[PDB]
Amino acid sequence: APEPQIQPSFVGKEGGLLFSVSLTVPENVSQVTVYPVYDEDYGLGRLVNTADDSQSIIYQIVDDKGRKMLKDHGAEVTPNQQITFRALNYTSGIPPGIYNDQVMVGYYVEIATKNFPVSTTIS
Secondary structure, eight states: OOOOEEEEOOOOSTTOEEEEEEEEOOTTOOEEEEEESTBGGGTEEEEEETTEEEEEEEEEEEOTTSOBOBTTBOEEOOTTOEEEEEEEEOSOOOOOEEEEEEEEEEEEOOEEEEEEEEEEEEO
């Protein structure tokens, strides 16, 4: 399982792109999910500004069709292909900084779960 990469969104809007995670699909993997764990049940995460405790951003992660990703529901994939997931702002309607959070990547081979730190820049 090669490492996913972060693509910053260089946002304060509802449904606004926050960042992207794209990865290469391993051999024998037929489904991939990337999902937040701040509110696992509802597939919501929380970005926190490293330089300011009081600033956060609630987000959901979606596939290419704008569908929400959960632990038990990922996008169908073909081995060796690339897939991109997008974190979208879940807040209603943002000061710059480095925002942190943790997500998971699930590979359906039997499922393999991997922890993936997220660190991204809001301009």
